[PDB]
Amino acid sequence: DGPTMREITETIAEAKKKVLDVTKEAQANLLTAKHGMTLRESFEDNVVRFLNEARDKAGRLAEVNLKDLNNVKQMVMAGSKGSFINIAQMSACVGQQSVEGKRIAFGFVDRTLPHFSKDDYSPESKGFVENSYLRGLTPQEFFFHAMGGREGLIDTAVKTAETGYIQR
């Protein structure tokens, strides 16, 4: 529904604002430098925490809007198939893509992908798929989604052989 979609949009927007504020603080060289962790590690932790909170909040918002005549709601509270995260990803937001915990690294020098200027850490440049499966993905986000899926496939293809050996 329209108003709920608008609230989703502004929720993601204020999350982006929090991220930008943190980046300004970091680039102004005053940070708490979180204990046990290096400066960049603290920065990455803060931003990933913010983005995942955004995704969770938006998904909860969509779910609590959703009508009782909605059939995917009917299945998901009826047990069998689907999930909260499935509803959230098909309607509200995909969320930040992942390559072993760290988000998408600068394979190209200083940048993730050749469509941006160097030395960014804004989430859309490094791979936050803000959008949703209903609206489809901007092509950069499409690429990062492909990265995450490929990681899952290769992990399956190695773990199956090793677990078979070690079962025998």
Partner 1 sequence: TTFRFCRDCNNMLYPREDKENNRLLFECRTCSYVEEAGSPLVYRHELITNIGETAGVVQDIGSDPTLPRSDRECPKCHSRENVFFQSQQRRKDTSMVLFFVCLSCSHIFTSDQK
Partner 2 sequence: VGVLAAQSIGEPATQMTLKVTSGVPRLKEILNVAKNMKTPSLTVYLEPGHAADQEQAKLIRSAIEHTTLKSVTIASEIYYDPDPRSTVIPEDEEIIQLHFSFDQQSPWLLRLELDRAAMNDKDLTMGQVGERIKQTFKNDLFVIWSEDNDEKLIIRCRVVRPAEEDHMLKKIENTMLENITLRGVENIERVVMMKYDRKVPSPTGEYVKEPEWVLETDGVNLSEVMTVPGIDPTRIYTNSFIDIMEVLGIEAGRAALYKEVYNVIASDGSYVNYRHMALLVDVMTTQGGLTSVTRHGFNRSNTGALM
Partner 3 sequence: HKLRDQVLKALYDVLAKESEHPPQSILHTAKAIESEMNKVNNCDTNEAAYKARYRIIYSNVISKNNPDLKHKIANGDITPEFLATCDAKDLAPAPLKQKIEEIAKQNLYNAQGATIERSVTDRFTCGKCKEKKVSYYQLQTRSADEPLTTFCTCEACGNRWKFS
Binding interface with partner 1 (CB under 8 A): 23, 26-30, 38-40, 43, 110-111, 117-120
Minimum CB separation of residue 152 from partner 2 in Å reads 11
Both structure tokens of 167: 């079962």
Query: Does 159 sit near partner 2 (CB under 8 A)?
Result: yes
3-state secondary structure of 145: helix
Residues in 19-48 that interact with partner 2 by CB under 8 A = 36
**Beta carbons within 8 Å of 127's beta carbon, 6+ residues apart:** 96, 97, 103, 104, 112, 140, 141, 144, 147
CA distances to 14, 34, 53, 69, 93 from 85, in Å: 21, 30, 13, 19, 10
Contacts with partner 3 by CB under 8 A lie at 35-37, 45, 49, 52-53, 56, 60, 83-86, 98, 149, 152-153, 156, 160
Residues in 127-156 that interact with partner 2 by CB under 8 A = 155
Query: Does 117 sit near partner 2 (CB under 8 A)?
Result: no
